[PDB]
Amino acid sequence: ALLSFERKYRVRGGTLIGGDLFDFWVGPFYVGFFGVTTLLFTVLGTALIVWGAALGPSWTFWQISINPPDVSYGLAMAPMAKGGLWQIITFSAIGAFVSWALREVEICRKLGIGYHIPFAFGFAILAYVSLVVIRPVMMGAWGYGFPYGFMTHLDWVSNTGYQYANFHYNPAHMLGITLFFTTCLALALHGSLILSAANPGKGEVVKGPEHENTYFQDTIGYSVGTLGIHRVGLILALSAVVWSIICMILSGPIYTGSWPDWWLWWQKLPFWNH
Amino acid sequence: ITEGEAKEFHKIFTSSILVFFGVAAFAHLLVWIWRPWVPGPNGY
Amino acid sequence: ITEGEAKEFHKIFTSSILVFFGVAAFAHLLVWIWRPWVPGPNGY
Amino acid sequence: ITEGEAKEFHKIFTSSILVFFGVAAFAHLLVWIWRPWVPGPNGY
Amino acid sequence: ITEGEAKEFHKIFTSSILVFFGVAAFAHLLVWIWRPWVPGPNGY
Amino acid sequence: ITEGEAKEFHKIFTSSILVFFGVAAFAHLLVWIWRPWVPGPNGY
Amino acid sequence: ITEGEAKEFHKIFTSSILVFFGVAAFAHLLVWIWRPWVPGPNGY
Amino acid sequence: GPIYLGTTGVLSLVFGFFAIEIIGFNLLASVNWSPMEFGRQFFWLGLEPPAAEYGLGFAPLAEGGWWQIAGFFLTTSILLWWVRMYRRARALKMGTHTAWAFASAIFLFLSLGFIRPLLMGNFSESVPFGIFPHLEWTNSFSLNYGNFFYNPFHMLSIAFLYGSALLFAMHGATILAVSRLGGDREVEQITDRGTAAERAALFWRWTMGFNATMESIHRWAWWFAVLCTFTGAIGILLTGTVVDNWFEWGVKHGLAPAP
Amino acid sequence: WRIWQLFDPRQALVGLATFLFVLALLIHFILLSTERFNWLEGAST
Amino acid sequence: WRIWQLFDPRQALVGLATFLFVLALLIHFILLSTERFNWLEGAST
Amino acid sequence: WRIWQLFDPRQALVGLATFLFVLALLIHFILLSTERFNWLEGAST
Amino acid sequence: WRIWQLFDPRQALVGLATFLFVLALLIHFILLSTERFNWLEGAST
Amino acid sequence: WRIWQLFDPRQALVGLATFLFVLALLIHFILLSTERFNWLEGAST
Amino acid sequence: WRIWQLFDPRQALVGLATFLFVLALLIHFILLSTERFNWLEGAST
Amino acid sequence: WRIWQLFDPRQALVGLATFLFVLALLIHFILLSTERFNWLEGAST
Amino acid sequence: NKGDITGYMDVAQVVLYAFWIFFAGLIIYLRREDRREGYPLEDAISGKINSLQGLGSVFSIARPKIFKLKTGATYAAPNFKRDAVAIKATRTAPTAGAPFEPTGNPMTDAVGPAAYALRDELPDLTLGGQPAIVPLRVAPTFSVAAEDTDPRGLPVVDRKGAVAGKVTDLWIDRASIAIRYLEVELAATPGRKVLLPFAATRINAKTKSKTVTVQSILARHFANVPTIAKTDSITRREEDKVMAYYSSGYLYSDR
Numbered sequence A: 001a002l003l004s005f006e007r008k009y010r011v012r013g014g015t016l017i018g019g020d021l022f023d024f025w026v027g028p029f030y031v032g033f034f035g036v037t038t039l040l041f042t043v044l045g046t047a048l049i050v051w052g053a054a055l056g057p058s059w060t061f062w063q064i065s066i067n068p069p070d071v072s073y074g075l076a077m078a079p080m081a082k083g084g085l086w087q088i089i090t091f092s093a094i095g096a097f098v099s100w101a102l103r104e105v106e107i108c109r110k111l112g113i114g115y116h117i118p119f120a121f122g123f124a125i126l127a128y129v130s131l132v133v134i135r136p137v138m139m140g141a142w143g144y145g146f147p148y149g150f151m152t153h154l155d156w157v158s159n160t161g162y163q164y165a166n167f168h169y170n171p172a173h174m175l176g177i178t179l180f181f182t183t184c185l186a187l188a189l190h191g192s193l194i195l196s197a198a199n200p201g202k203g204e205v206v207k208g209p210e211h212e213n214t215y216f217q218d219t220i221g222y223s224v225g226t227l228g229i230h231r232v233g234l235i236l237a238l239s240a241v242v243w244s245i246i247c248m249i250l251s252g253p254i255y256t257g258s259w260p261d262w263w264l265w266w267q268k269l270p271f272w273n274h
Numbered sequence B, C, D, E, F, G: 001i002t003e004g005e006a007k008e009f010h011k012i013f014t015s016s017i018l019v020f021f022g023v024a025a026f027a028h029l030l031v032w033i034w035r036p037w038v039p040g041p042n043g044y
Numbered sequence H: 001g002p003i004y005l006g007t008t009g010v011l012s013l014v015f016g017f018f019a020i021e022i023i024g025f026n027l028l029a030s031v032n033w034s035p036m037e038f039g040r041q042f043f044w045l046g047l048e049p050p051a052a053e054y055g056l057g058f059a060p061l062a063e064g065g066w067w068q069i070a071g072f073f074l075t076t077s078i079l080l081w082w083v084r085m086y087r088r089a090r091a092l093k094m095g096t097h098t099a100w101a102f103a104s105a106i107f108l109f110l111s112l113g114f115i116r117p118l119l120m121g122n123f124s125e126s127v128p129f130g131i132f133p134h135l136e137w138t139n140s141f142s143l144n145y146g147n148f149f150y151n152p153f154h155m156l157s158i159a160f161l162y163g164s165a166l167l168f169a170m171h172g173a174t175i176l177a178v179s180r181l182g183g184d185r186e187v188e189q190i191t192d193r194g195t196a197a198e199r200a201a202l203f204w205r206w207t208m209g210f211n212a213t214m215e216s217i218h219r220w221a222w223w224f225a226v227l228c229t230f231t232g233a234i235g236i237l238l239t240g241t242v243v244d245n246w247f248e249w250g251v252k253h254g255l256a257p258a259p
Numbered sequence I, J, K, L, M, N, O: 001w002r003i004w005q006l007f008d009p010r011q012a013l014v015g016l017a018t019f020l021f022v023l024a025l026l027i028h029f030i031l032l033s034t035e036r037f038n039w040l041e042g043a044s045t
Numbered sequence P: 001n002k003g004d005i006t007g008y009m010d011v012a013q014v015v016l017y018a019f020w021i022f023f024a025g026l027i028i029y030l031r032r033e034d035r036r037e038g039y040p041l042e043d044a045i046s047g048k049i050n051s052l053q054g055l056g057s058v059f060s061i062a063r064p065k066i067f068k069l070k071t072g073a074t075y076a077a078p079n080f081k082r083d084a085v086a087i088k089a090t091r092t093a094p095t096a097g098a099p100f101e102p103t104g105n106p107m108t109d110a111v112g113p114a115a116y117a118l119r120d121e122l123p124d125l126t127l128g129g130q131p132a133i134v135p136l137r138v139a140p141t142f143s144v145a146a147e148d149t150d151p152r153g154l155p156v157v158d159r160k161g162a163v164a165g166k167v168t169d170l171w172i173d174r175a176s177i178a179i180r181y182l183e184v185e186l187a188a189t190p191g192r193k194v195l196l197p198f199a200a201t202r203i204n205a206k207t208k209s210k211t212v213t214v215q216s217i218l219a220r221h222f223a224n225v226p227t228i229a230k231t232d233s234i235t236r237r238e239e240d241k242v243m244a245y246y247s248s249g250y251l252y253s254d255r
């Protein structure tokens, strides 16, 4: 099935690799060679996750967990019953994410638009890789990656954040929190303004950029613009992800001590050291 | 604002502020009679 | 907004600031009589 | 604003800074006679 | 922006910075008389 | 910036740099006589 | 970018990098006399 | 710049300024009026809420009374700011979506500060005014009430926060991608659909099977942002009042194996 | 009346009323937060 | 006396009032903080 | 004497007054912090 | 003298005043922090 | 002399002065951190 | 011996001085991190 | 020699310099990590 | 037994399930709002209204909402106005999911990245009713910031170094302050002027001319840029046509 305006855009070309073989659609989904690879990796990883659930002790969705190999294994590939399944799932997921991003690139090429969307998804892929590959590799063992479970990855988050006394005192983690809260606040403001301009109340006429700028100027003192707000939102989300990656790289590969104790330098400054 | 309007508004403002200050002074006198708020050498 | 109005402003401003400072001085005198705020060599 | 107004501004600025510095010096003299702020070799 | 005015600016700037440095030097001499800030090999 | 301007900047710039280096060298010499910063074999 | 001015860069750049390397070599020699950084079979 | 305050803005600014002055004066008095110690310990300084024995009444000024006054003034200022952003939208003949999205954040703020203490009978577990004090309040709240990770409404609030970040990273990237086709004129695209909106919808359809419109994506964003704080406020209200241990609740409801 | 030619009566009154109400509320709260002057929880002098 | 041609009368008076009230409130808060001058608590001397 | 042509007399005075007020407040806070010079508490010498 | 034609003597003076005040404040705060040179809280020499 | 042909002399002066000041401040703070060269709270050699 | 046709001289000189300064700072901090080559603290050979 | 027409003769030099420098830094840090080849600490054989 | 509703149910679980019900309803509503443009779905081949849908099709498509505009006209969403089934392209395979192959010149035929939406033939209007996008000649009040470089008089160059023309005017937006289009006088056929989107043009910094580089299309494609009826105003349809023609360069420039 097609939309009322899709046939004129469903054109040949735009593939990065594979040529005409995979240039076709199955329903609404564009397939592509990287889509075929995405399906390959998704099916493999999902089947192996269900296999790990079957090997596990419970079939409860919350309690299903695929655990990484023990820290004693180091960076060596582990037996499939002792974390090798986790490693295979990790690399299949990485392949699936990369293939999804490249499929988005192919769709962007076909539609003649920018690559900002795959570029932004690259940051999510980078955060995932840093959590499952980069940080455990610089830490010396695959056991430091989070287990693939609904609750066990939360337990991993809790244990990792309490290994450093209090993760709330990580300076890059504070910046990540600030940018994550600001992204939500800005999203609420942007959606609210656009919906208030498009729906100005029953019996009223749709407003425009003048009114949109005037509203926020009158309320808070300044505005950003029509495209400045989208650029700011993208930069905010990507900066939050980047500072989260930075805090995770600092926590354990570089800094191993207590983050609350890291803040003594502020109290030891020469102009206040009494 | 005309000169006459300013003068009449000033008159009303003066009357209202005098009434307000009188009411506040009466309330303060009642509160002081009930319990003074200036401690002595040995406190309250 | 004019210099002629500035004469009258400055006059009224001088009167008002004098009233304000007189009230402040009287209150400070009362507070000093109640409890001085300059300690002696051996504290208060 | 203009050059003559600048003359007057400089005159009043000098007079006001003189009165400000004189008051500051008198206050500092009073504070020094109350409690000096330069400790000796052993302390105060 | 203009040479003569900038030259006289340098003249008054030197006349001011020399006074500033003299005041700073006198203050530093007084502070050195009070408590020197260069410890010896045995310390203070 | 013209050629003459560049040359003027250059000559007085190196003139000011020589004085800066001389002052820094004198200060570092004084600090060296105070306490040398190069430890010996056994240490300080 | 003109070839002649580019050659003049090349010349002065070479002179400056040679001065920089000579100074760095002098400093490294001084540090080598101070404490060599190449350990022997028995270490330092 | 051209900030329109009005009567409601004047009220809100006066109330919030009084609250800020009270908080700052208390912080500065905590270090015995030392500017040096204030700079040294600024993060560690805080204005703590009253103890549990005082209940909801007025605690002494040195023992939480200043906190109560500052908190009430801040709450009044925030409510008057909500009224302000409602009235500005009404005056500009626009919708009140901004006011009703701010209402969710106000609901969460009241749940953290006033509503939950009202339910519990005292202000002891309210949020103190200070950077590190309120971070420590967060940590101690989670630690005391089991594990907040096991709160399902905390789960939902985190999911909607991640969804807000994900949705803004999608929407901004899409609008920048179609910015060369006039996609930044979003209301104009809503009123008269253009090739920018068509290509954005078609990209997302070909990517993940379904798409939104130039207005409905903002509806998605608005609802995600609101639901974050709404679910979080619900979780805060239910924490301690009906569930004393979220880990034990999760164990009972299958979120974790029984110890 | 000279003052009312400069300050708009509406703005002046609105600002003054807001300030006075906030000050009165603050003073009443301060009194309630004291042992001696709390009338709703009265103790001995 | 020509100061009001330099500074706007309205803004000057409003800012002066705000600054004076802020200073008065700060000094009153300090007096409340101290023990000797806390008229509400009323410590002995 | 030429300073009031170079600098704006309206901005210079406001900046100077703000700077002086901030400096005075800072010094008074430091004095309140110190034990010897805390005139309100009045420690013995 | 040449400096003042390239560098505006309205911005150079303001920058110099702010930088000098910041440096003086920093040095005074350092001296207050140190024990030997703290003149307000006089300790042994 | 051609360095000033490539680089604005004003910007070169500003950047050089700022860099020198920051480097001096950093070295002074490092010396204060060190025990031997802390000239304020001096310790015996 | 004609690199400067390829690279802009200004960007090259503002990118090669920063690199050298950062490398020198890193090497100095590394030396500070070692007991043997720390000239500020000072230890035996 | 036609690879210099294939690839930008500026980006090629920049990428090669950045690759060689990063490889050198990685190898030097690895050597610092090793006990035998750590010239700063200088362990015995 | 603090929060217990029954032996196993409790208040937290009850509230969680209430939120689940509300969120399901909210997802239904959000999809309803999503289906206000482009729906109902048509068959890929025939173009008739036909799709695989369940019992939720009754609630799937909402009643048309009416947008009241300041010009007195109204826009309905969904408007149910479909594009023509026949387009100037032919599928490479008879399957429904097969892609289309342009019959002739895709850039002129407006298929694929060159396709544009049939917007209203009316220029965007500001709050005062005047057209939003006008050349700088008609708007003397507006000016380019002194800190920026005026693109007027700067050569227009493509990715291969071929010069397409010179900038003679700038088209601004009065509603949201920005530069929307650049008026370029083509080197070939002197006197012919084409509109050039600003968002598709980057300035080449230090080139001693700051050539306004156009990576979208080549120099030879400038002669085929769609024209505009008026010399001081541009309609929404013409605007889309120009942006769509320029956006198709990345895919059909070398073809």
Ligand code: 07D
Binding pocket: B037, C020, C023, C024, C025, C027, C028, C031, I007, I011, I012, I015, I016, I019, I027, J014, J016, J017, J018, J020, J021, J024, J028, J031, J037, J039
């Ligand atoms: C021994 C301890 C002690 C003690 C028991 C005690 C009691 C109390 N005291 Mg205090 N006080 C003590 C000491 C002491 N005390 C002061 C004074 C005072 C003042 C002056 C305020 C001021 O300067 O406001 C300065 C403000 C001015 C003049 C301007 C008005 C401010 C406004 C409009 C606010 C700006 C906001 C806007 C939105 C603008 C409006 C808009 C438009 C017009 C368009 C005053 C009204 C006042 C209030 C009380 C209270 C409520 C109490 C309580 C709760 O017990 N105190 C005396 C004075 O008049 O000083 C000039 C003075 O000298 C002196 C001393 C020594």
Ligand code: 07D
Binding pocket: A097, A124, A125, A127, A128, A131, A156, A157, A158, A160, A161, A162, A166, A167, A168, A173, A176, A177, A180, A240, A241, A244, A245, A248, H138, H139
């Ligand atoms: C002691 C416990 C403790 C503690 C007190 C405390 C406090 C707080 N913290 Mg912290 N934190 C603690 C623990 C701790 N903290 C985190 C992290 C963070 C982040 C990162 C978010 C992000 O960017 O996610 C970025 C997300 C990723 C990883 C994106 C990856 C996703 C990809 C590629 C896509 C996957 C797609 C599929 C599988 C397909 C789906 C298919 C279909 C639907 C069909 C961040 C901003 C953040 C939030 C808060 C806040 C707001 C608070 C509050 C309220 O106090 N914390 C670190 C991290 O992950 O950094 C990357 C991390 O590991 C770690 C630890 C150990």
Ligand code: 07D
Binding pocket: A157, A158, A181, A184, H020, H023, H074, H078, H105, H106, H108, H109, H112, H129, H137, H138, H139, H140, H141, H142, H143, H148, H149, H154, H157, H158, H161, H228, H229, H231, H232, H233, H235, H236
């Ligand atoms: C031990 C620590 C710990 C822990 C291990 C863990 C885990 C994680 N959590 Mg959690 N959390 C912990 C504890 C904990 N958790 C939070 C909450 C959240 C949020 C906040 C949402 C928000 O937008 O807040 C932000 C909104 C607020 C707080 C309300 C908006 C405020 C308004 C309008 C007021 C306007 C303000 C002014 C006018 C200025 C006034 C001036 C002055 C006072 C001076 C959220 C989504 C979230 C995220 C994470 C993640 C991602 C992680 C990871 C990765 O570890 N957590 C709870 C809540 O209900 O949130 C709504 C809540 O209260 C609470 C507690 C105590």
Ligand code: 07D
Binding pocket: F021, F024, F028, F031, F037, F038, G023, G027, G028, G030, G031, G034, M020, M021, M023, M024, M025, M027, M028, M031, M037
């Ligand atoms: C505790 C005492 C101490 C200390 C251990 C120390 C080390 C050294 N300072 Mg000094 N200095 C100390 C104190 C201090 N200092 C200065 C500054 C400056 C400036 C001036 C700017 C300039 O252009 O100098 C001009 C720069 C020149 C002269 C560059 C020439 C460099 C050469 C030929 C090579 C240097 C290396 C050696 C000779 C190795 C021999 C070592 C051994 C045998 C063991 C600057 C770059 C500089 C150089 C150095 C050098 C070469 C040394 C060596 C190797 O001894 N010092 C700071 C300043 O003014 O910054 C703007 C500042 O404030 C401040 C303070 C507090």
Ligand SMILES: CC[C@H]1c2cc3[nH]c4c(c3C)C(=O)[C@H](C(=O)OC)c4c3nc(cc4[nH]c(cc(n2)[C@@H]1C)c(C(C)=O)c4C)[C@@H](C)[C@@H]3CCC(=O)OC/C=C(\C)CCC[C@H](C)CCC[C@H](C)CCCC(C)C
Binding pocket: A038, A041, A042, A043, A044, A045, A046, A090, A092, A093, A096, A097, A100, A104, A117, A118, A120, A121, A123, A124, A147, A148, A149, A150, A153, A237, A238, A241, H162, H163, H165, H166, H169, H170, H173, H207, H208
């Ligand atoms: C970087 C900024 C934000 C961001 C952006 C972003 N995400 C994106 C995009 C963008 C711009 C897309 O275009 C793309 C998309 O199409 O979304 C609909 C996407 C996307 N990001 C998603 C989710 C997501 N994004 C997140 C976060 C973020 N992404 C950032 C906050 C998060 C979290 C945790 O905050 C999640 C959960 C998806 C909706 C989608 C990814 C689609 C995809 O990868 O498809 C290919 C893969 C599959 C269909 C399934 C693969 C299954 C694997 C074989 C197994 C993986 C197991 C896994 C490692 C663990 C699972 C258990 C966990 C409980 C631990």
Ligand SMILES: CC[C@H]1c2cc3[nH]c4c(c3C)C(=O)[C@H](C(=O)OC)c4c3nc(cc4[nH]c(cc(n2)[C@@H]1C)c(C(C)=O)c4C)[C@@H](C)[C@@H]3CCC(=O)OC/C=C(\C)CCC[C@H](C)CCC[C@H](C)CCCC(C)C
Binding pocket: A181, A182, A184, A185, A188, A189, A192, A219, A220, H012, H013, H014, H015, H016, H017, H020, H077, H078, H081, H082, H085, H098, H099, H101, H102, H104, H105, H225, H226, H228, H229, I019, J017, J018, J021, J022
């Ligand atoms: C949907 C949930 C998200 C959200 C949304 C949200 N927040 C919002 C809004 C929305 C939709 C707004 O519309 C509103 C806003 O205006 O945003 C710009 C706001 C807002 N939320 C804010 C912040 C904020 N949002 C946060 C987060 C979030 N809110 C969530 C992520 C957070 C955190 C903790 O993450 C914070 C801290 C504010 C910026 C703003 C509300 C502003 C407000 O209420 O201000 C009250 C007023 C004052 C404190 C007055 C201050 C006065 C000053 C002292 C100046 C001096 C005045 C004058 C001198 C006084 C008179 C003196 C005389 C009496 C002497």
Ligand SMILES: COC1=C(OC)C(=O)C(C/C=C(\C)CC/C=C(\C)CC/C=C(\C)CC/C=C(\C)CC/C=C(\C)CC/C=C(\C)CC/C=C(\C)CC/C=C(\C)CC/C=C(\C)CCC=C(C)C)=C(C)C1=O
Binding pocket: A182, A185, A186, A189, A190, A191, A193, A194, A212, A213, A216, A220, A221, A222, A223, A224, A225, A226, A229, A232
């Ligand atoms: C279609 O497009 C649309 C627009 O366009 C037409 C728009 O416009 C907007 C509107 C969006 C914006 C205008 C910006 C959006 C971007 C962000 C949210 C990220 C950037 C975050 C900020 C700068 C925060 C801005 C929030 C404000 C101004 C709220 C105003 C609240 C008050 C006036 C109440 C009193 C203020 C208080 C109590 C604090 C408010 C917060 C700040 C002013 C920032 C925090 C500052 C401090 C507390 C200390 C720092 C002090 C400063 C900054 C001064 C000193 C200088 C320094 C640098 C330190 C949208 C959504 C939009 O869809």
Ligand SMILES: COC1=C(OC)C(=O)C(C/C=C(\C)CC/C=C(\C)CC/C=C(\C)CC/C=C(\C)CC/C=C(\C)CC/C=C(\C)CC/C=C(\C)CC/C=C(\C)CC/C=C(\C)CCC=C(C)C)=C(C)C1=O
Binding pocket: A026, A027, A029, A030, A031, A035, A036, A038, A039, A040, A042, A043, H166, H167, H170, H171, H172, H174, H175, H197, H200, H201, H204, H207, H208, H209, H210, H211, H212, H213, H214, H217, H220
């Ligand atoms: C300008 O405003 C904008 C809008 O627009 C106007 C918008 O819309 C949006 C977009 C935003 C929304 C629509 C709002 C909703 C978005 C969110 C809330 C974000 C969260 C998103 C989700 C929760 C949805 C996630 C769903 C995903 C990731 C899709 C999953 C897809 C797959 C797993 C398959 C991918 C398809 C492929 C690879 C091919 C097709 C596959 C099939 C049809 C099934 C299998 C097919 C076969 C068996 C036959 C073919 C098989 C082959 C070729 C062999 C393979 C071999 C194997 C067996 C493996 C934005 C941002 C925007 O700002």
Ligand SMILES: COC(C)(C)C/C=C/C(C)=C/C=C/C(C)=C/C=C/C(C)=C/C=C/C=C(C)/C=C/C=C(C)/C=C/C=C(C)/C=C/CC(C)(C)OC
Binding pocket: F001, F004, F005, F006, F008, F009, F010, F012, F013, F016, F017, F020, L002, L003, L006, M009, M013, M016, M020, M026, M027, M030, N021, N024, N025, N028, N029
């Ligand atoms: C255009 O010109 C006209 C015509 C107008 C003429 C006018 C001319 C005028 C008015 C000119 C003005 C000239 C002036 C005032 C010039 C001043 C020049 C000065 C003072 C120059 C000083 C230069 C200093 C330099 C270059 C110093 C560099 C030092 C470096 C890079 C040191 C680095 C040290 C390191 C990295 C050490 C680190 C050690 C530790 C341990 C700290 O590292 C961790």
Ligand SMILES: COC(C)(C)C/C=C/C(C)=C/C=C/C(C)=C/C=C/C(C)=C/C=C\C=C(C)\C=C\C=C(C)\C=C\C=C(C)\C=C\CC(C)(C)OC
Binding pocket: H020, H021, H023, H024, H025, H027, H056, H057, H058, H059, H068, H069, H071, H072, H075, H109, H110, H112, H113, H114, H126, H127, H128, H129, H130, H131, H134
């Ligand atoms: C000029 O003066 C200056 C500006 C310099 C003064 C300086 C001020 C400063 C520095 C201010 C800010 C300081 C800091 C560090 C503030 C940080 C604040 C933070 C991070 C706070 C975080 C959380 C706090 C929360 C969520 C608290 C909410 C509390 C509420 C909602 C309390 C409500 C209380 C009520 C309604 C009380 C009711 C009881 C009554 C009074 C009705 O009866 C007893």
Ligand SMILES: [Fe+3]
Binding pocket: H189, H190, H191, H193, H197, H213, H214, H215, P037
């Ligand atoms: Fe639309």
